């Protein structure tokens, strides 16, 4: 039916999800990358973020 999945998802945690793992909790929305924090910890080196201090 059209009513199925009718509810708006224009904001809140249901509007976003991890671009890697489709998780809703722990999103990093900074700089518009939209990765969960664990997947960011894995992929940060090849994204270009490094630890200096």
């Amino acid at each position: 039916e059209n009513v199925w999945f009718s509810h708006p998802r224009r904001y809140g945690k249901g509007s976003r999800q991890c671009r890697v793992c489709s998780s809703h909790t722990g999103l990093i929305r900074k700089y518009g990358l939209n990765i969960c924090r664990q997947c960011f910890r894995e992929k940060a080196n090849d994204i270009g973020f490094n630890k200096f201090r």
Partner: protein, 111 residues
Amino acid sequence: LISKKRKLVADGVFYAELNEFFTRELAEEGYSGVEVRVTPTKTEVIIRATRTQDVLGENGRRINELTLLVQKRFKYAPGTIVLYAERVQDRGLSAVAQAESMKFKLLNGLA
């Protein structure tokens, strides 16, 4: 028309995504990394693998379908994205190639 911060993290996640994609399907070709060079008139993706004949296929059919796949996914114009293959040197000095060879040996059933 994007800020420089978001542009640089965009190419970062783009490199990471295509590297994950290439290490997912090109495992049996010794895929040992990828490099990108954006350039006026074209962006080029240099894959560094061992079995270049296997990542190419017959007359570059696999390179063609890979170019088409990344173009369809990243909404590039046809021709503005190009892929090259490269027989990487020093295969022993590459952790991912040795790791995938170990994986394939253990899947074949070696001790």
